[PDB]
């Protein structure tokens with residue numbers, strides 16, 4: 001109930017929300033059906049429109065008017081945004097030459113530069129270039145301020161997850177808005193764009209920017225706008241708030257536009273009908289900037305122009321139907337469209353079996369346009385699993401396609417209407433969106449590389465002098481956007497220091513069931529090999545310092561001619577293995593006599609070693625090596641690669657992948673990049689939280705042993721950004737690509753896996769591309785500790801994702 005008999009007189013667009021049953025006058029009151037009876041009359045004036053004309057200049061103030069052109073309007077803060085242009089001979093902001101904003105030029109009484117977030121729904125990244133002729137205000141912001149070529153959204157590339165990520169710095173799995181539609185099995189409640197459940201605060205986790213601000217004494221405008229409030233009124237409202245007394249005036253504001261998304265769905269991303277929405281958004285930006293100029297705030301305020309996601313061509317004829325694959329289609333519930341999420345229709349149906357559903361949806365049609373996954377098997381870069389609102393079965397849909405349950409869902413929602421959609425994998429080029437920063441705190445005429453939207457919350461906090469709530473950004477990685485207010489972090493402290501074991505065990509102390517034909521024998525070279533075991537080549541293979549271990553454990557550094565490792569006594573394998581392969585390196589074979597060779601490591605106790613008998617007995621499990629024997633520097637050095645301390649458990653299906661990577665791709669990358677440094681290792685994430693498992697979280701061991709089975713294998717592949725310098729003699733910035741491969745007992749993910757590995761392995765690896773930061777979370781290791789480069793530059797490097805998309 002709402003007693004709508006209260007009044008909005010003196011309350012239009014009030015900032016504090018008054019509680020039920022009292023009636024509301026805030027910018028969301030319409031969405032709750034809660035506005036006071038006179039809200040439209042008093043707060044949504046439209047009389048005479050949005051622009052001054054020559055005949056209105058110096059008029060007598062008429063309070064019915066939407067905006068004012070009377071002499072008093074500037075002091076009242078309610079002039080039409082073109083008032084000074086029409087009535088005082090001033091220029092529009094867009095017609096003024098760009099001039100660097102070296103310091104904030106703010107009115108007296110401003111404690112900090114305000115921040116205005118100008119958010120646009122469905123604003124695809126390529127609109128900045130492709131629409132530039134029709135968007136002169138936006139183009140001035142972009143060219144004179146700080147811009148990225150694109151900004152990466154979060155998956156799913158839908159509106160509610162992305163706007164909330166922008167607000168919080170959190171992945172959807174952590175903030176809880178995992179889709180525009182959701183079922184929470186604990187609440188037994190459904191969240192939908194239509195209806196009232198979405199207003200319940202229990203859905204919305206983390207701490208959004210407006211709350212972070214308010215808790216730290218920084219006043220915030222209300223970010224949300226009911227759809228019926230015209231954009232001109234949203235801008236005039238912000239400009240009015242900026243005219244409030246110092247003790248009442250907010251420091252942070254958001255504008256939101258439903259365009260160009262609304263038209264994009266109807267017309268496709270580049271339909272000819274899209275020009276007009278882009279023009280109208282640009283006009284709105286011009287109103288804001290002219291309005292700020294009138295208030296002498298255009299060189300005071302920091303402006304962010306930012307999108308939530310892009311827009312792809314999608315039509316209803318490009319729909320896959322689950323009814324063509326499943327006999328049991330009426331026993332499932334599907335969340336459909338540009339992603340799929342499947343659960344049982346009834347929790348009482350004991351016949352429901354996810355394994356059978358997955359198999360029925362796997363590689364069944366030659367050009368099949370979706371791929372099913374258990375959520376823990378999704379690419380780790382999506383960070384889309386650790387929430388009870390995310391169904392176990394997920395369908396990753398190809399760009400340009402939909403999935404639906406039955407055809408009647410698509411023609412009873414007899415043809416269709418729409419030409420655009422979004423939601424796909426967040427590395428897809430059509431899903432990328434925009435970022436521009438303009439103001440005293442941003443840099444001048446500066447391009448920055450693409451970055452992820454999870455990073456922006458920290459920067460918005462920096463811009464307002466706020467301490468960010470705990471989030472998934474890497475604070476510092478966007479310092480290069482800012483003139484001032486940079487955040488200067490310190491590297492994390494190493495928690496566990498390594499042991500450096502020497503030769504401590506005799507061969508006969510080992511009873512591991514291993515064998516090797518290595519009984520083949522010099523003072524010159526005996527000293528030389530001792531030096532290699534003491535670390536004499538470590539400078540070549542450990543180029544950026546050893547990784548730091550950020551948790552309590554027991555591990556050993558092991559040195560070798562061709563590679564260095566940090567060997568875990570607890571997990572009985574390396575945490576990391578580091579090696580450098582020059583451009584001129586030669587690939588060799590595993591010699592016949594060493595095919596099944598595994599050698600005890602006399603530096604490491606039998607008790608802290610793997611054993612070969614476990615692998616013989618485990619009929620499902622084989623092994624591979626972290627440092628590849630194919631890339632040994634010499635036949636004598638190759639023996640090091642068969643140490644038991646370089647062995648890791650691998651399913652035979654996975655060994656196909658790993659062997660191709662090691663034998664073919666590493667050398668290819670070294671040839672292309674002028675040497676590479678590789679750091680490889682295991683990952684254990686049995687609870688799919690994106691974080692390193694403790695020992696007691698491990699669900700699978702090599703049969704009969706205490707050898708834990710990794711859920712994934714990573715590699716970090718680093719070289720010189722200036723590829724005219726070899727990786728091992730690089731003077732400047734670095735270049736990286738990484739992956740986190742799922743350690744699966746089949747290659748069902750790869751529909752062409754019966755073919756030669758040259759036709760499918762690299763496609764797999766691209767799908768499982770990763771940031772170094774992702775590997776850091778999953779391992780508790782901290783990389784790049786010892787470089788010549790600034791720490792903030794290294795943080796940027798660690799957040800890089802190699803996406804493998806064209807320009």
Ligand SMILES: *[C@@H]1O[C@H](CO)[C@@H](O[C@@H]2O[C@H](CO)[C@@H](O[C@@H]3O[C@H](CO[C@H]4O[C@H](CO)[C@@H](O)[C@H](O[C@H]5O[C@H](CO)[C@@H](O)[C@H](O)[C@@H]5O[C@H]5O[C@H](CO)[C@@H](O)[C@H](O)[C@@H]5O)[C@@H]4O)[C@@H](O)[C@H](O[C@H]4O[C@H](CO)[C@@H](O)[C@H](O)[C@@H]4O[C@H]4O[C@H](CO)[C@@H](O)[C@H](O)[C@@H]4O)[C@@H]3O)[C@H](O)[C@H]2NC(C)=O)[C@H](O)[C@H]1NC(C)=O
Pocket residue numbers: 170171173174175176202203204205206383386387388470471472689690691777
């Ligand atoms: C991305 O950034 C974020 C933010 O930094 C990282 O997320 C954090 O990760 C931590 C580890 O997973 C996690 O720490 C736990 O916090 C528990 C207290 O949590 C509440 O309070 C916080 C603070 O206000 C609040 O933010 C939380 O919000 C979550 O839950 C609500 C629902 O109540 C949601 O609305 C909200 O969206 C959010 O959900 C997300 O996180 C939860 C986990 O908290 C997930 O389950 C959801 O799916 C969703 O992802 C909470 O309201 C605290 O109780 C935990 O302590 C247990 O574990 C430690 C291990 O160190 C152990 O020592 C303790 O004894 C304790 O164990 C006991 O409870 C166990 C479980 O019942 C039981 O098994 C044991 O036997 C013990 O009795 C823990 O410290 C932190 O909350 C989240 N924060 C957020 C915002 O998500 C995230 O990791 C980053 N991601 C990556 C990839 O880097």
Ligand SMILES: Cc1nnn(Cc2cc(C(F)(F)F)ccc2CCC(=O)N2CCC(CCS(=O)(=O)c3ccc(S(=O)(=O)/N=C/N(C)C)cc3F)CC2)n1
Pocket residue numbers: 028031117119159160161163164165166167168193198199200201204208223224225226227254255256306
């Ligand atoms: C999602 C989401 N997450 N964060 N935001 C805010 C935001 C953040 C940022 C950025 F970049 F800075 F981060 C820019 C612009 C905005 C404003 C978006 C806006 O005006 N919109 C129009 C209203 C619409 C639906 C509202 S509703 O579902 O009916 C509803 C839903 C929920 C609520 S609520 O209960 O108040 N939500 C509370 N929390 C904690 C988010 C109200 C509501 F009306 C959303 C789009 N939106």
Ligand SMILES: [Ca+2]
Pocket residue numbers: 121122158159160261308309
């Ligand atoms: Ca959107």
Ligand SMILES: [Ca+2]
Pocket residue numbers: 684685686687688689690691692693
């Ligand atoms: Ca984990």
Ligand SMILES: [Cl-]
Pocket residue numbers: 653656746747753
């Ligand atoms: Cl296979």
Ligand code: NA
Pocket residue numbers: 614615616617618619620621622
């Ligand atoms: Na085996």
Ligand code: NA
Pocket residue numbers: 747748749750751752753754
């Ligand atoms: Na396959």
Ligand SMILES: [Zn+2]
Pocket residue numbers: 122159261262265422
């Ligand atoms: Zn949309």
